[PDB]
Amino acid sequence: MTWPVKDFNYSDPVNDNDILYLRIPQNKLITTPVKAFMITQNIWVIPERFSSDTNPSLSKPPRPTSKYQSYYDPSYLSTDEQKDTFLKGIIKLFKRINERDIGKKLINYLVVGSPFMGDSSTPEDTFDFTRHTTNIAVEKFENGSWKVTNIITPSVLIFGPLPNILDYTASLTLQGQQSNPSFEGFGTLSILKVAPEFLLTFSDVTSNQSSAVLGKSIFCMDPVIALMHQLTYSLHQLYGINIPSDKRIRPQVSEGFFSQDGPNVQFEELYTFGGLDVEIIPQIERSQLREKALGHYKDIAKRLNNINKTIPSSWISNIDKYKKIFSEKYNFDKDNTGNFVVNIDKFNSLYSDLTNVMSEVVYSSQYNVKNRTHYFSRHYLPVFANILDDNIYTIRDGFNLTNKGFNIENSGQNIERNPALQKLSSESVVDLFTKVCVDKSLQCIKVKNNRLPYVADKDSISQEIFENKIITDETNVVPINPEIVDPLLPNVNMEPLNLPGEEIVFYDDITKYVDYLNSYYYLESQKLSNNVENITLTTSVEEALGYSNKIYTFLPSLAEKVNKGVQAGLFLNWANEVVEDFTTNIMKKDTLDKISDVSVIIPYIGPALNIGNSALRGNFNQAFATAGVAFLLEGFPEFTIPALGVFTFYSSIQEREKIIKTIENCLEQRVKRWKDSYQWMVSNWLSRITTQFNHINYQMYDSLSYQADAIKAKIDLEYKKYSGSDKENIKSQVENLKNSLDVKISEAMNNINKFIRECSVTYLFKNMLPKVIDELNKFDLRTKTELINLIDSHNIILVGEVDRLKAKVNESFENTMPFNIFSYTNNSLLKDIINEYF
């Protein structure tokens, strides 16, 4: 059940078995053979930096070369000591992977899932053993030169990082002849590029599952989960079900609304993350991908039945060896003839296992760790951690070490409560910005790219339902014992591989010009300066922008109570008054006039963020009830959906009794359409709408955090100034009182989270759904009319007044099919709404 993980030092000498020098043509940064270590069967670790760029450099480039957060260090992984640390790092993470059954099953799949000895171009009767998609050259330095002695046929190679150490998508990038086999069943050996000590971060600001005692926190990812995600790319690549990067979500950027200048998100990324976000890809797309892979598996089955010859021509003895290997890998049956065959039950089982079970969110629940809730959650500055140190991180518990204070109720992934997690400065982390500016074409403002919501381009999703189509008569839609072995094989004389490499592209900041002082201005007004001296709260956004010593507040009552100070009273009488005013204000809720589909609203969002230029005019509550839910999505165009694909039939098709089959198909296909259209609506919602509403959660949490940071700054000011009898004696009471603000902020966020979640769900029901039903009604009307005429056209033929029977088929168009969540296809969506409503 468990594949053994071997220990190594970088020192250990080459032994023509599991420590070798390997030639990796794909690595443009390093062109010699490099030392590799087989930590378990067919899985090799290569402690070297990697790049696929022409003219690779490890240096910080002059402008950004991607839409991802970046960090550059040419020294990283240069010395033999650093390589030793990296090597042992990945051995340790692999032991951790074996600490649950899901990770044991993953590793087993990789080891026995070796890439097929051939692709589409290989003759059907042939195994080709000569291709770089299966082979890596083994080389020894003899007589002043490198020399190929052998090959290996690995499953995964694990490199250190790209120039951008924070990179997390380079393992998807397949060059040359590796792409196609990865999508056509055959599969390709996989090459990961990884830096496990560098950990990406996330928060629980928008989750109702955050700690009531500690409040909202920023956590780091467990490195084992990060590495398992990467190895899930290897899995899809090896089993030949990789989804090509042509299938992807793209960002919409526009004038007049704010969205993130974000990366593309491949369908592979959505699959390997898992959970609800997989529904951004409608079932019609997912079904095609499954059916495609099925086709290729059947095709690999037929190949194994007809194989006579080999390349090279010598290797004819090895046919049975590889017939076994691949027969086991794809899990074929034998029919009574003796031939290999795809069992459909077994294929669907394998396929769903590789695509649903093996995903990030499943992994993180199994290892009992904190993790990103949804795909488009906010990223923060990362951290660094020496994961070899058993005081910081262990095989059994990860960061949750009991004897250091960490446990289920006090996670070791928490970045502020774990002082072994070393934070990276924004100085060292390069990212894109959106510059925001007043009036034409006060100062301009910078907004970091990660603090903007991702909104997908709608054309990015799926266009199937919008295509006119013709319906016809034929239209529809036990284990093996882990055994470590010598992996050397005899050299096939491979032709050398020279790959072009990728061109580098540079990327600019975006400048956006805006008519008023919007949310981003209102948030900047709330900030403290680095080196605070003597602050006061102000009710005037322009003033706070003006002077470093004035910070904006959206609570007038708070301003007077803060600025007073301690006027010959006891310190805590003032402090408690301030905190009780803050607390009591941020817990306010107002019930609204009119019949809105949202119960209560949170009134201070208006003056906090100036939504709709609503501050000064002071009318957030009415404006929201007037405009309804879409009021919160500033500038975002009214939801629209184009005309659906019409259904039509053949002109003739007079001959045959399956003139009638066409009609049953059109009716069933009309049902499929209502379904596919709802699914398309949920994708828009998840990739375009929920992200913009959640952006208000994050913006509200920032402003509550600025108000709190200002209250604390003024408390510290006033405590140094204070000289009363009790000063020394109330010290802990003051510290504790300041710390209490995190819990108070957190409880306000329960209300804001719930309000935002309601707004979001009602946008789906009020602003999107009616437009979709409209269009399905035009599609109904049209398809019925076309069915009437098909009958009337084929009047003389087929029917002996079976014509009259076909009228009642058009009484099936009386009913609409309104959107219904208590329905097996909407289960995942139902689950997610239930839980944040509780």
Residue numbers in the entry: 1 to 441, 458 to 493, 511 to 871
Show sentences the authors wrote.
BoNTs are synthesized as a single polypeptide chain (150 kDa), which is post-translationally cleaved into a di-chain molecule composed of light chain (LC, 50 kDa) and heavy chain (HC, 100 kDa). LC is the catalytic domain and a zinc-endopeptidase, while HC is further divided into two sub-domains of equal molecular mass called the translocation domain (Hn) and the membrane binding domain (Hc). Inhibition of neurotransmission takes place by proteolysis of one of the SNARE proteins that mediate cell secretion. Synaptobrevin (or VAMP) was identified as the BoNT/D specific substrate and is cleaved at the Lys59-Leu60 position.
The crystal of LHn/D diffracted at 2.3 Å resolution in space group P6422 with cell dimensions a = b = 173, c = 222 Å; α = β = 90, γ = 120°. Despite the large unit cell, a single molecule was present in the asymmetric unit corresponding to an unusually high solvent content of 75%. No electron density was observed for regions 442–457 (between the two domains), residues 494–510, and the C-terminal poly-histidine tag (last fifteen residues), all in solvent-accessible areas. Additionally, one of the most intriguing features of BoNT, the ‘belt’ region (residues 458–547), which is part of Hn and surrounds LC, was visible in the electron density map (despite high solvent content in the crystal) in the structure presented here and highlights the intricate interactions between the two domains. Mutation of the zinc-coordinating H233 to tyrosine caused displacement of the catalytic ion, replaced in its position with the Y233 hydroxyl group. Overall, the role of the zinc ion appears mostly catalytic with little impact on the structural integrity of the light chain.
